Amino acid sequence: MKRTFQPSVLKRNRSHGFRARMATKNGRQVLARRRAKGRARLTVSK
Amino acid sequence: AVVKCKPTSPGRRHVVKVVNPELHKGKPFAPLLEKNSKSGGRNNNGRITTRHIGGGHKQAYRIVDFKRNKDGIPAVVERLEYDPNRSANIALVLYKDGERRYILAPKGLKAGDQIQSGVDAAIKPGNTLPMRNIPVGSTVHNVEMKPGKGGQLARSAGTYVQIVARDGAYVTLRLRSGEMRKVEADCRATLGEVGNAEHMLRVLGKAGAARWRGVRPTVRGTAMNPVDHPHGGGEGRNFGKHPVTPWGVQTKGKKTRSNKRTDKFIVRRRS
Amino acid sequence: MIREERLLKVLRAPHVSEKASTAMEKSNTIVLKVAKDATKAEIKAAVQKLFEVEVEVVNTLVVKGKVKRHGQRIGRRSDWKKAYVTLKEGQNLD
RNA sequence: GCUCGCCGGAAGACCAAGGGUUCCUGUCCAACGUUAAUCGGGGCAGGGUGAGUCGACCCCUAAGGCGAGGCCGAAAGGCGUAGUCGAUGGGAAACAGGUUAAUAUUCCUGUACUUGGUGUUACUGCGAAGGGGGGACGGAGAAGGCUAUGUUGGCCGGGCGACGGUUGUCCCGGUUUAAGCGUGUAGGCUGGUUUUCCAGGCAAAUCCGGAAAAUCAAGGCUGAGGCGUGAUGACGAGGCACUACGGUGCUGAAGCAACAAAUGCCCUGCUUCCAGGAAAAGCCUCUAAGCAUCAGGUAACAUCAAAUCGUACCCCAAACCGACACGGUGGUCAGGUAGAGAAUACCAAGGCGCUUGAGAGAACUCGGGUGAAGGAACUAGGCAAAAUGGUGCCGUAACUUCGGGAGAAGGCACGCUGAUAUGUAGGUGAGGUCCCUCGCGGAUGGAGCUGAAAUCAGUCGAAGAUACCAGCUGGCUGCAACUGUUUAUUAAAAACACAGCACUGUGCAAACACGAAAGUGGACGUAUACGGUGUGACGCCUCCCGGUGCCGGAAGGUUAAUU
RNA sequence: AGGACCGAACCGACUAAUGAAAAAUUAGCGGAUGACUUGUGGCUGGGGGUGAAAGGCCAAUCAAACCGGGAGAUAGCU
């Protein structure tokens, strides 16, 4: 059965990657939030 | 000519083809071509703005000349061509100076016919001259509404317009709709009717044919649930309401012209 | 033209392994560890100057670092650049 | 190690994606492995991924994204021009053999190619953000020419049979060879060459386009395959020396022909249809500003250059997505016998026996086999089973929209051997002989090879479409015309859609829709068009305006802000 | 020629019996040149999308997704 997650690196990066997050305001805020929390992996970026 | 196809299969039974042998069997004039990608009836927001559009065959865009400005040069018709972009047929013409253009093929036009634009041009089919030069009572097509803009009225397969009157700076046209309309007398127009008049006699004959023409199927509002359409819901088949659009506006009669800027040019509305 | 200092900083070490020994003995090819940033021409220049020996050609590759586990803690070894340097016929290297 | 069994259009081989060391070697067996474990995709250590020509990067663009100015917007921001990104598409170049425990079109051996510089001598119009050409394009169908590949014969090597026979019309194996370079064929497309002029190609153009005029019928482009060379080479069945029993080193015959033949190539071709079928660069070409005897261009020759990143391994799976060593997952390769076949059966190459076993041979459950007599009596219901099942030929009703119905129904033949005919009809096609504008040519010729289908005669069986495979059929009737779609995971239908019909709106800055707007779709469309609503092939058809809607009217009544 | 026929791949999911499986199995079943199917990338966003329309689908979630916040909502109820 085709399960929901069907990985694709490029698609992952474009969707969720660092630059994408940077591009828009809301993404930047998300980034800031994650930094505040102390996340080790700020983004999906490997 | 129209051709009723033999019923060797359902979906072929009711088919009627409109076959013109005189069209060009060959690849169109490539210089005048250009790309034309499909919308899916969706705008820049990405939302569907006009339902029932989608798919269909890849099509190129022939660059038709509706402005028709090569004044004084006589042109000769090379061939008639299938345009997927319109109900009419187009004609590839060759001006004496070596330029080629696509034009709406009028009714009587065929290969070898000579045509001409200009004030001086001769009043014969396919020739184009300002409507102050065109005699009253003539049939014309590809009519400009604004001078210099390009023909906008009467471009569809078997349309034409009647010049009923010329009163000073304006002439009054009889549009195919039956609407009588004033138009500036200096606007341009092409003599005769537009060509492919038996276009209406074709019948698709199956669902797939409609799809080929980029038309997605139509769901009736009454078949929906109320949350979707004003007509939705009802146990079994119920329709206890006045007909309306998906957006609640009355459909069977309610007029919707709101343009107060051009009211003056409409002599008489259609009926 | 490569600067001497850069040349000196290129070459990290000789690589000892069975495959390396075989390459040395048969094909007259030395296997070096080099700076990850070091390009082929650079490596060649450095070979020529610092080992005083003619080079035919350099093949390079990047070795990825192994993931290991010290006790309970996971940790990755460094990636590093390997270079097969083929030396001109009759070139004997100390 | 020897037997047995399974897959073999896969359960084999190679990739992409995704994973990220799982690869190889040594070592260990606590935990992990549904048992044991000396084994492991487990632990620990070490090793392993070599590129000018493969891919990325790079040049070009699609859908789309971002977007200087700009337009719009309380703010945030939205749209969008110039631009710039964006492959899943276009754009230069490599093949064969050998080698590692583990990489290889990357190492080695041989033989190649590419496109840049730089320098040269030789020549002499070069030059783009611009013009033109090209790239550049659909579906289906039909062949013909080919090859991949396979079969047989020939040849070469080996063999003479654990049991009757087996020196022959016997048995086993092998019989392979690239890119490149030369040739330019089967075939496809197109008339060429020169001269003159011209409101066209945002300017110019010697280019394209268009007009004339002259002259010759061959000119050019394209093109699989074959042939030659590449190759006195490599590889080569197996023989022979050493042996850490893993292998290593030497050596090495023949290496031809015919037939058959793709879904691969010629073919981005041809024929045809309507639903009318990317873009841009690379590439060719034309000039402009320019420069002017310099640069630049093309000409060979020399030299330098090709960086960087990926390259292990799995990849229909125990390594990816599924919590698991648990169904899903795109591409490429496609042997033999039978067969229409990529179905099916048995096999090859190759890969596996699915990580608990041993007994026993109760009930009951699951999955199968057979069954006297009856044959739907079962049951809500013939559910399920059983049955039918192929090719050829004969034959086939109502009704019909004249196409259908129809494989209607129902029947007959079917194996093997011999003869017709020491293998026919056909297909292919060598020598020889003749012609020739000479070649991959044309005629004639028929050797050899291959080879159905039929008829007649015989013959065995209970049975010859013998296994696997492979329609059940007919009669009346509701609904829906039909092919389609649908509740992912209890509903596939009479529901939706449909072609068709009708009403209605909409004159283009269209109606309408998304948008505080700008704008966008509608549509690069224009009433033979587009939108909305209902009905729903086809046939015969299809009173009430009082109510509520809509349309038109505006005499009077009433009536806002305002005053 | 064909939204033509029989039929593998491929797409589906009518009947049947039966956790390896949070929808599968085997045996049969429908389509199989098209209103087909499929890879890669792109766009549409929550009273919003998309919808051959079933209130279907929008990450095992849908008559209004998920995450965080108002928030210790309110609970004459248990």
UniProtKB/Swiss-Prot annotation, chain A:
Recall the GO molecular function terms of this protein's record.
Answer: structural constituent of ribosome
Q: What processes does the entry annotate via GO biological process terms?
A: translation
Q: What keywords is this UniProt entry annotated with?
A: Ribonucleoprotein, Ribosomal protein
Source superkingdom:
Bacteria
Q: Which InterPro entries match?
A: Ribosomal_bL34 (IPR000271), Ribosomal_bL34_CS (IPR020939)
Q: Name one Pfam family in it.
A: Ribosomal_L34
The UniProt family comment states:
Belongs to the bacterial ribosomal protein bL34 family.
- The protein, known as: Large ribosomal subunit protein bL34
The source organism is Escherichia coli O45:K1 (strain S88 / ExPEC)
Lineage here is: Bacteria, Pseudomonadati, Pseudomonadota, Gammaproteobacteria, Enterobacterales
From Swiss-Prot, chain B:
Q: Does the keyword DNA repair apply?
A: no
The alphabetized list of GO BP terms reads:
cytoplasmic translation; negative regulation of DNA-templated DNA replication initiation; ribosomal large subunit assembly
Task: Mark the residues carrying the PTM N6-acetyllysine.
Answer: 241
Q: Where is the composition biased (Low complexity)?
A: 38-47
Keyword list, A-Z: Acetylation, Ribonucleoprotein, Ribosomal protein, RNA-binding, rRNA-binding
Provide a GO CC annotation, any one: DnaA-L2 complex
SMART domains membership: Ribosomal_L2 (SM01383), Ribosomal_L2_C (SM01382)
Name the Gene Ontology molecular function terms of this record. Answer: RNA binding; rRNA binding; structural constituent of ribosome; transferase activity; zinc ion binding
Which Gene3D superfamilies does the UniProt record give?
A: 2.30.30.30, Nucleic acid-binding proteins, Ribosomal protein L2, domain 3
**Protein family per UniProt:** Belongs to the universal ribosomal protein uL2 family.
Q: Quote additional remarks.
A: This protein can be partially replaced in vivo by its H.marismortui (HmaL2) or human (L8, from the 60S cytoplasmic ribosome) homolog.
Per the entry, what this protein does is: One of the primary rRNA binding proteins. Located near the base of the L1 stalk, it is probably also mobile. Required for association of the 30S and 50S subunits to form the 70S ribosome, for tRNA binding and peptide bond formation. It has been suggested to have peptidyltransferase activity; this is highly controversial. In the E.coli 70S ribosome in the initiation state it has been modeled to make several contacts with the 16S rRNA (forming bridge B7b, PubMed:12809609); these contacts are broken in the model with bound EF-G.
Subunit structure of this chain's protein: Part of the 50S ribosomal subunit. Forms a bridge to the 30S subunit in the 70S ribosome, contacting the 16S rRNA. Interacts weakly with S6 in one of the 3.5 A resolved structures. In pull-down experiments interacts with CedA.
Protein name listed in UniProt: Large ribosomal subunit protein uL2
The organism is Escherichia coli (strain K12)
Taxonomic path: Bacteria, Pseudomonadati, Pseudomonadota, Gammaproteobacteria, Enterobacterales
